[PDB]
């Protein structure tokens, strides 16, 4: 019995799969095709898993997809079998395959960031991020407002951290000076105050929350590199939030719009991350003023902004007109990041103070966030069920997830983060992963086609892959 003329085996795009391609030297009638495999870990005495095919359905050879039990390298042997079970010589080849669940989150973060940089980074005169891909014009050569720049910065800083001790450490380090120079174009002196304006010139609007996001990532960046220019930006942002953002109208809390026409409302989205930033600066410096502010932020959020019925946080409160120290009209809409930042804050305060009441609060918020913003899902590509991040603002959701990473740091319970990780695995291998290399961020299940993507949302997803990588590490 003549053997197969050729055998080649290949990894495919799907997990736990080996594509077997074979050529029959000549077609012989009534020949059976035995395809056998074994994981090479068992050695030469390892048992084979075998299937026998009718050669009349593979007259000149063909291909067959082997579904194997796990990631690994496999020996695949083809033997042709004639009458009286007379076996030809066997031919063998090795191939390796993978499991989706063993995907490197870092490799996802880096591969997506390569796309995000390619499509958004340094397209005009500044080493800054474009708002949109595909290219659009508008103000400032299409560069994003500082909120969007900050989303890009969060992604960059998370990758700078996640790439430490990897092949990409040098590359992300390489980018630091231009990343810093780019965001600093938005560090604007206007009306005797220097802070991050929406666009890189005086005369623009300026928001306290825009600033806190940058401050947070400057604090994170400082912890990686120990370059005090990052610490000084985090400190300067905190000083601005403290001196100008905070007052005791509505009982406390941080303002929203500083310029050009100031707001009077107090917002979770500037107060909660101000508390987080205060925690981070306390951990870096041990200076009590930071911890005092963190506690003030938390206490105000608990007293005024948390709905006792579901543990989730309202948007913003405006002052009572007749006594602005008292709360007035409440905007009750609940956004993910406005409960995930209080979660992160509660977790940091627990770690700093060891007061168990902060952890009790944290667990309540985490459960409420998981109930509200995740939903039971079956991933066809992953062949697995989990609670996917429901359709929504990807940057809000990544900012929320920061609180879940913070909570894991305390209790080491991976349940919530496994849902986050499976969401991102599904976003990587499922239909949300667009052929451009961007992700259809409106709905990570893949149900929503997109043809235009913005940096704040794309960068959010790079960030989340990188946060998952840091968590894995």
């Amino acid at each position: 019995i003549d053997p197969v003329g050729q055998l080649e085996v290949y990894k495919t795009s799907r997990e736990k799969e080996i594509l077997v391609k074979f050529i029959r030297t000549n077609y012989v009638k009534d020949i059976q095709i035995e395809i056998a495999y074994r994981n090479t870990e068992s050695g030469e005495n390892g048992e084979w898993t075998t299937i026998v095919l009718n050669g009349d359905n593979y007259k000149y050879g063909g291909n067959y997809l082997l579904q194997v039990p796990a990631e690994g390298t496999y020996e695949v042997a083809i033997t042709l079998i004639g009458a009286n079970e007379l076996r030809s010589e066997s031919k063998s080849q090795l191939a390796s395959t993978f499991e989706y669940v063993k995907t490197s989150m870092f490799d996802c973060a880096h591969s997506m960031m390569t796309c995000v940089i390619k499509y958004y980074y340094h397209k005009g005169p500044r080493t800054c991020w474009q708002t949109y891909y595909p290219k659009e014009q508008g103000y400032w050569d299409g560069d994003a407002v500082v909120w969007g720049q900050g989303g890009g910065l969060s992604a960059f800083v998370a990758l700078r951290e996640a790439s430490v001790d990897t092949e990409q450490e040098e590359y992300y380090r390489s980018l630091e000076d231009d990343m810093f120079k780019g965001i600093q174009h938005f560090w604007v002196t206007d009306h005797g105050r220097t802070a991050y304006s929406v666009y890189p010139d005086s005369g623009n609007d300026r928001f306290y929350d825009d600033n806190v996001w940058i401050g947070l990532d400057m604090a994170k960046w400082y912890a990686i590199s120990k370059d005090v220019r990052y610490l000084n930006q985090a400190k300067a942002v905190w000083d601005y939030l403290s001196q100008y953002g905070w007052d005791n109208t509505c009982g406390g809390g941080v303002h929203w719009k500083e310029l050009n026409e100031p707001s009077k409302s107090k917002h979770t989205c500037s107060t909660a991350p101000t508390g987080v930033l205060s925690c981070k600066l306390y951990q870096l410096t041990h200076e009590q003023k930071y911890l005092d502010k963190a506690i003030e932020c938390f206490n105000w959020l608990q007293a005024y902004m948390q709905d006792p019925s579901d543990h989730l946080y309202y948007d913003n409160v405006s002052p009572d007109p007749e006594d602005p120290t008292q709360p007035g009209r409440m905007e009750t809409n609940k956004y993910s990041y406005n409960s995930g930042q209080p979660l992160q804050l509660a977790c940091l305060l627990y770690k700093i103070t060891k007061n168990e009441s902060y952890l009790t609060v944290a667990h309540q918020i985490a459960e409420a966030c998981h109930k509200k913003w995740f939903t039971s899902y079956h991933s066809e590509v992953l062949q697995r069920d989990f609670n996917i991040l429901a359709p929504g603002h990807a940057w809000f959701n990544t900012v929320m997830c920061r609180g879940f990473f913070e909570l894991y740091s305390i209790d080491k319970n991976p349940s919530y983060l496994e849902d986050v990780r499976n969401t991102m695995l599904h976003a990587w291998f499922g239909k949300a992963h667009h052929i451009s290399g961007l992700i259809n961020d409106e709905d990570l299940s893949g149900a929503v086609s997109m043809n235009k993507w913005e940096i704040l949302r794309q960068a959010s997803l790079v960030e989340l892959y990188a946060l998952l990588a840091i968590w894995e590490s």
Side-chain angles (χ1 to χ4, degrees), residues 3-5 7-10 12-20 22-24 26-28 32-40 42-46 48-58 60-64 66-70 72-83 87-88 90-91 93-101 103-166 168-169 171-172 174-180 182-263 265-321 323-328 330 332-366 368-370 372-383 385-411 413-430 432-451 453-473:
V4 290
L7 165 65
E8 304 294 340
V9 299
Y10 304 96
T12 75
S13 64
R14 292 158 55 79
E15 73 168 351
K16 297 187 281 192
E17 277 191 8
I18 299 158
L19 172 62
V20 182
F22 61 96
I23 298 184
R24 286 176 68 183
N26 264 17
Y27 167 66
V28 185
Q32 303 305 278
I33 304 169
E34 177 189 280
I35 304 180
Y37 71 86
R38 53 185 183 181
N39 193 311
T40 64
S42 62
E44 69 198 76
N45 303 134
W48 297 87
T49 301
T50 299
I51 190 168
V52 182
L53 307 176
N54 180 3
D56 295 337
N57 297 314
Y58 299 88
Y60 303 106
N63 55 79
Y64 182 82
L66 290 174
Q67 294 193 12
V68 298
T73 295
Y74 290 83
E75 184 187 2
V76 178
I78 296 203
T79 311
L80 300 186
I81 305 170
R87 302 170 57 86
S88 79
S90 304
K91 292 193 167 172
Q93 293 278 28
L94 305 183
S96 306
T97 185
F98 59 95
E99 285 168 49
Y100 295 134
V101 74
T103 295
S104 168
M105 292 289 101
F106 177 77
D107 289 350
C108 293
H110 175 63
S111 165
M112 188 178 179
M113 185 58 138
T114 297
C115 298
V116 174
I117 286 173
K118 172 184 181 53
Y119 292 139
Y120 293 88
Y121 177 62
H122 196 187
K123 301 303 176 172
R126 286 165 296 277
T127 50
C128 289
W129 304 98
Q130 291 283 287
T131 306
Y132 294 114
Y133 177 80
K135 182 76 168 98
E136 301 203 8
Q137 302 299 316
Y139 309 118
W140 294 100
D141 311 277
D143 283 338
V145 297
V146 85
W147 187 21
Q149 302 298 336
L153 183 68
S154 300
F156 169 72
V157 170
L159 261 164
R160 169 73 175 93
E161 178 173 346
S163 62
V164 167
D165 303 321
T166 85
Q168 309 303 329
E169 181 173 346
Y171 174 67
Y172 289 103
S174 99
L175 291 169
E176 286 183 313
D177 283 349
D178 277 350
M179 292 291 173
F180 186 75
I183 191 59
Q184 289 312 102
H185 294 298
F186 294 75
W187 188 244
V188 164
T189 299
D190 209 359
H191 312 294
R193 305 175 193 177
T194 307
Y196 292 104
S197 296
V198 298
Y199 272 134
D201 202 3
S202 56
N204 280 285
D205 288 340
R206 186 150 69 195
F207 295 87
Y208 294 106
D209 55 347
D210 281 7
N211 273 268
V212 74
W213 307 121
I214 309 296
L216 283 163
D217 288 299
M218 289 289 172
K220 189 176 179 65
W221 200 352
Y222 175 67
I224 303 162
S225 52
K226 306 303 304 287
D227 180 345
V228 299
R229 72 184 179 169
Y230 312 133
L231 176 62
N232 289 339
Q233 287 318 109
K235 288 182 164 183
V237 164
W238 185 93
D239 287 345
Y240 163 76
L241 292 163
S242 270
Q243 183 174 200
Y244 300 110
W246 179 281
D247 61 43
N248 72 340
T249 64
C250 307
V254 180
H255 280 283
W256 174 55
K257 184 174 187 180
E258 179 212 349
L259 293 171
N260 284 299
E261 298 315 316
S263 66
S265 40
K266 297 305 190 67
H267 294 237
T268 304
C269 68
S270 56
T271 304
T274 292
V276 179
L277 175 59
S278 292
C279 289
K280 301 313 295 175
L281 286 169
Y282 181 76
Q283 294 176 305
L284 289 168
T285 69
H286 288 160
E287 296 173 36
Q288 184 64 38
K289 67 182 179 191
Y290 295 122
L291 181 52
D292 293 342
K293 176 60 65 166
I295 292 167
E296 270 194 319
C297 279
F298 176 84
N299 288 344
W300 181 81
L301 290 164
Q302 296 313 90
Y304 297 94
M305 300 305 285
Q306 194 181 29
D307 185 339
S309 70
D310 62 7
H311 308 291
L312 299 180
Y313 292 78
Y314 305 132
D315 184 336
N316 68 81
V317 62
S318 297
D320 173 348
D323 179 3
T325 65
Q326 299 308 306
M330 185 69 73
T332 52
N333 284 350
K334 286 159 181 166
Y335 302 104
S336 57
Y337 76 137
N338 280 342
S339 291
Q341 287 298 279
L343 170 60
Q344 185 168 25
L345 175 55
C347 290
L348 283 157
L349 284 171
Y350 174 70
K351 291 194 279 181
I352 292 165
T353 71
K354 314 303 180 190
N355 184 340
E356 291 290 328
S357 65
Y358 290 122
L359 184 53
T360 300
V361 164
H363 278 130
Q364 291 176 307
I365 301 169
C369 281
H370 192 239
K372 180 96 153 86
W373 288 293
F374 300 69
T375 187
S376 174
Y377 183 73
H378 173 72
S379 170
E380 184 173 347
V381 66
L382 300 183
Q383 318 189 344
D385 314 317
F386 58 94
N387 305 297
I388 196 167
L389 283 171
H393 199 297
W395 178 89
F396 286 0
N397 283 353
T398 292
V399 175
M400 176 196 63
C401 287
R402 299 177 186 172
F404 284 107
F405 292 106
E406 206 75 49
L407 179 63
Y408 180 94
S409 81
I410 297 167
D411 74 351
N413 162 33
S415 300
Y416 300 126
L417 288 176
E418 282 166 358
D419 279 336
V420 175
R421 186 174 192 274
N422 281 326
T423 291
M424 298 304 289
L425 283 176
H426 179 76
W428 189 261
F429 293 104
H433 204 171
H434 186 266
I435 191 64
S436 60
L438 298 183
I439 294 180
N440 292 344
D441 58 73
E442 296 178 14
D443 182 352
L444 296 179
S445 76
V448 171
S449 171
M450 295 170 64
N451 50 37
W453 305 262
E454 77 180 288
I455 186 58
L456 181 70
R457 300 169 190 260
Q458 293 303 293
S460 84
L461 296 174
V462 172
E463 179 192 342
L464 188 51
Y465 281 118
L467 295 183
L468 285 161
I470 292 161
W471 177 59
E472 300 197 306
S473 93

